[PDB]
Amino acid sequence: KDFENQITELKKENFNLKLRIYFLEERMQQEFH
Amino acid sequence: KDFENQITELKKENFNLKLRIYFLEERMQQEFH
Amino acid sequence: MPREIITLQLGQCGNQIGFEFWKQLCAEHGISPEGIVEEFATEGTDRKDVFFYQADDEHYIPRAVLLDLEPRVIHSILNSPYAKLYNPENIYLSEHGGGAGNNWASGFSQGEKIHEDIFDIIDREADGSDSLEGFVLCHSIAGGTGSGLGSYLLERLNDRYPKKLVQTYSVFPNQDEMSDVVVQPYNSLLTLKRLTQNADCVVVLDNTALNRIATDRLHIQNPSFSQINQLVSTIMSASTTTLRYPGYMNNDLIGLIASLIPTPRLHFLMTGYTPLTTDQSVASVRKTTVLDVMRRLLQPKNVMVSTGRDRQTNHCYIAILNIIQGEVDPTQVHKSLQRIRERKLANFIPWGPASIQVALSRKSPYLPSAHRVSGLMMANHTSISSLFESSCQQYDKLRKREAFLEQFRKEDIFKENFDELDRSREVVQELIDEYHAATRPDYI
Amino acid sequence: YFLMDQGDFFVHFMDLTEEELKKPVDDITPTRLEALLELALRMSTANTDPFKDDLKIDLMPHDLITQLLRVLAIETQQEKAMVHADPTELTLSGLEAFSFDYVVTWPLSLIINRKALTRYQMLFRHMFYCKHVERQLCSVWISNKAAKRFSLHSAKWFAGAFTLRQRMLNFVQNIQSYMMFEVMEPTWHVLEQNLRSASNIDDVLGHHASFLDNCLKDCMLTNPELLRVFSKLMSVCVMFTNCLQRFTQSMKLDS
Numbered sequence: 149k150d151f152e153n154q155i156t157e158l159k160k161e162n163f164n165l166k167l168r169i170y171f172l173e174e175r176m177q178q179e180f181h
Numbered sequence: 182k183d184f185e186n187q188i189t190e191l192k193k194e195n196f197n198l199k200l201r202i203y204f205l206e207e208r209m210q211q212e213f214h
Numbered sequence: 215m216p217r218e219i220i221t222l223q224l225g226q227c228g229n230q231i232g233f234e235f236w237k238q239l240c241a242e243h244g245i246s247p248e249g250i251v252e253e254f255a256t257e258g259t260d261r262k263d264v265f266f267y268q269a270d271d272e273h274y275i276p277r278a279v280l281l282d283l284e285p286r287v288i289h290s291i292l293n294s295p296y297a298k299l300y301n302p303e304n305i306y307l308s309e310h311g312g313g314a315g316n317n318w319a320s321g322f323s324q325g326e327k328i329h330e331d332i333f334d335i336i337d338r339e340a341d342g343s344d345s346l347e348g349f350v351l352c353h354s355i356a357g358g359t360g361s362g363l364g365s366y367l368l369e370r371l372n373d374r375y376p377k378k379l380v381q382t383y384s385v386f387p388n389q390d391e392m393s394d395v396v397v398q399p400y401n402s403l404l405t406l407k408r409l410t411q412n413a414d415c416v417v418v419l420d421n422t423a424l425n426r427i428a429t430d431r432l433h434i435q436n437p438s439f440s441q442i443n444q445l446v447s448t449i450m451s452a453s454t455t456t457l458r459y460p461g462y463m464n465n466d467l468i469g470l471i472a473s474l475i476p477t478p479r480l481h482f483l484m485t486g487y488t489p490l491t492t493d494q495s496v497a498s499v500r501k502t503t504v505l506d507v508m509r510r511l512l513q514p515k516n517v518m519v520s521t522g523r524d525r526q527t528n529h530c531y532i533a534i535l536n537i538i539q540g541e542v543d544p545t546q547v548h549k550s551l552q553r554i555r556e557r558k559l560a561n562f563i564p565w566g567p568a569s570i571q572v573a574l575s576r577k578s579p580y581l582p583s584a585h586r587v588s589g590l591m592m593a594n595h596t597s598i599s600s601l602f603e604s605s606c607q608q609y610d611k612l613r614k615r616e617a618f619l620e621q622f623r624k625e626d627i628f629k630e631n632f633d634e635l636d637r638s639r640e641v642v643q644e645l646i647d648e649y650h651a652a653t654r655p656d657y658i
Numbered sequence: 659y660f661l662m663d664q665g666d667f668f669v670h671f672m673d674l675t676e677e678e679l680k681k682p683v684d685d686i687t688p689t690r691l692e693a694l695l696e697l698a699l700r701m702s703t704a705n706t707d708p709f710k711d712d713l714k715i716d717l718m719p720h721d722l723i724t725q726l727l728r729v730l731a732i733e734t735q736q737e738k739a740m741v742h743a744d745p746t747e748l749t750l751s752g753l754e755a756f757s758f759d760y761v762v763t764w765p766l767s768l769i770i771n772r773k774a775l776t777r778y779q780m781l782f783r784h785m786f787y788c789k790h791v792e793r794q795l796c797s798v799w800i801s802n803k804a805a806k807r808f809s810l811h812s813a814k815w816f817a818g819a820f821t822l823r824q825r826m827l828n829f830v831q832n833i834q835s836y837m838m839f840e841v842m843e844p845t846w847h848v849l850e851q852n853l854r855s856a857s858n859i860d861d862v863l864g865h866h867a868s869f870l871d872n873c874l875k876d877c878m879l880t881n882p883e884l885l886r887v888f889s890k891l892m893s894v895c896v897m898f899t900n901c902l903q904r905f906t907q908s909m910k911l912d913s
Contacts, residue, residue, distance in 0.1 A: 172205030460665015476824025544839025
């Protein structure tokens with residue numbers, strides 16, 4: 149259960165970081181570009 | 182060793198994605214200023 | 215959006231079922247028998263628009279039309295405490311209190327003769343309901359109005375609202391008990407045919423099963439027609455608890471019908487209640503596990519359907535839906551699904567989609583639940599094919615032996631021959647064969 | 659708003675506000691959506707919810723899964739292939755774009771960051787998409803009623819539609835049961851307990867971060883390929899229902 153929890157937490161944090169990066173890239177493309 | 186391999190990739194991926202967001206956010210806040 | 219249901223009560227049994235269901239809905243939504251919302255239900259979570267129609271007095275009035283050809287049931291419904299709860303304009307009472315004479319052909323003739331009055335009440339209820347979803351026909355399969363007028367009402371609801379679900383609370387006759395109407399077999403066959411053709415889904419409420427369950431599980435010695443109507447009202451309040459109290463899953467009749475009827479034609483549902491015990495049977499510090507509830511519901515002592523224990527028909531559930539009223543842990547629901555699947559607490563049909571859903575929903579705040587976990591079981595089982603076969607065989611016995619054939623042939627539906635009863639038995643036999651196929655891998 | 663428990667508002671949220679959800683990015687008029695939201699807000703017993711004003715209409719500049727697969731299913735091959743894909747010029751309906759965003763004040767509730775607001779908006783848009791899809795499936799299930807008085811053995815199109823709906827409705831009912839049982843029932847109490855345990859800014863942030871991130875991993879929508887697999891599995895049953903309904907529409911107008 150520890151490895152599954154670690155994988156799930158890693159995936160959630162990866163999704164949050166990916167969402168932040170996606171929002172930043174979309175904002176940069178909409179404003180700078 | 183698979184648990185450490187998972188941790189190593191989780192850390193590296195999070196550190197790199199957060200570096201990407203670091204560049205995105207710093208290069209956005211200056212455009213918001 | 216609210217989804218009102220036009221409750222059409224036909225025959226004495228149907229009128230009792232409709233009146234009891236209206237009383238249970240008023241109690242669960244906290245609407246007083248005068249329709250003036252009870253003081254405790256002003257802030258109630260009951261979707262009163264969803265279940266009851268809001269009259270000019272704001273009375274929580276279910277869109278219920280009580281149409282019976284015998285004045286006894288109509289008078290009893292009008293003499294119930296909930297008279298001001300429902301709208302008077304939707305109750306059509308035939309001054310000719312002669313009934314259909316336990317003949318389904320005569321009942322259909324009565325339904326068609328009062329079709330203007332009854333169809334008027336149905337259309338009035340549909341116009342008085344914001345999003346009237348369909349009609350629920352509570353009637354008796356062995357009665358004349360219940361079987362015959364039930365067929366007529368189901369056909370009329372299907373014709374005026376072909377896109378509206380036609381649910382029937384058909385009181386199936388006692389296949390093991392000698393029906394007092396020798397033509398009651400033909401009436402039962404015609405009611406089954408109405409369920410199969412002019413009704414979108416039929417919940418068979420076998421009075422023999424009602425008496426057996428009340429006596430054995432609820433310890434109710436000799437359940438009366440009043441007792442059967444009260445049990446139907448309690449089961450309806452349990453099924454509409456999630457209707458008044460908005461939940462996350464199975465929020466509409468169409469959704470429940472879809473989850474319980476893999477075959478559009480094979481929507482005949484057997485009934486069960488869990489835990490099946492008298493209110494005096496207080497489960498002593500017994501934390502009813504979701505798996506324990508599933509086992510008790512699967513116990514035949516808890517099923518409210520008189521399905522012949524036919525070893526020839528491999529009874530299996532086409533779809534199983536457990537309506538839980540009370541504080542039920544959703545994680546316990548998932549554990550219940552796992553335990554029931556592992557222990558085979560419920561037998562599923564071999565030729566239907568595997569549907570074991572565990573949904574946590576709240577009960578009506580105005581409806582107090584004595585059991586922390588109360589269970590209503592709507593299962594499509596091939597044992598209903600056994601009950602349908604018993605009903606069809608009784609109908610064949612009546613038609614072939616001309617039992618009460620004077621009463622059957624006296625109506626236009628059987629004026630030339632017992633064609634209405636014969637087609638009814640054929641429809642019942644076809645449904646039974648399809649249900650047995652559904653429990654068999656070859657249905658699809 | 660975006661956390662269920664408004665069951666009446668949920669039943670009135672997908673029945674009415676999904677009119678122009680299939681319209682273009684800017685084809686749907688938001689005035690009708692706002693009017694419908696207000697009507698469902700105040701035409702029933704849902705007034706107990708005190709933050710319906712906080713439920714603001716939003717629209718991600720991608721689909722709820724278009725942006726997801728553009729970032730979550732990125733950094734392998736799509737971070738430069740379709741990470742920044744613009745949905746406006748492509749087929750991106752209102753339902754695909756719309757979401758709901760939250761912002762909170764500076765002197766009080768200064769923790770609603772634009773990132774947390776966007777995460778909550780994606781969560782709301784995906785939860786209401788699922789609720790609307792469940793409502794649509796329940797509506798499509800009743801299709802075999804116009805010919806319910808007709809034998810289904812000779813209704814190949816309608817009979818096949820019913821036979822496939824036999825499993826499609828189970829696929830929706832069991833899903834809506836299990837997900838609401840596991841996430842919503844657990845997560846509501848979990849968030850309540852974490853908030854009751856928080857005392858400092860750090861503790862409240864930890865409680866909120868749990869309630870957000872753990873739910874972000876409960877849905878299993880954080881993978882680069884499972885999202886695409888879910889999209890393929892979800893765009894097939896709905897397409898089947900639509901094709902069956904189009905074949906069955908001959909009874910509506912062709913008959």
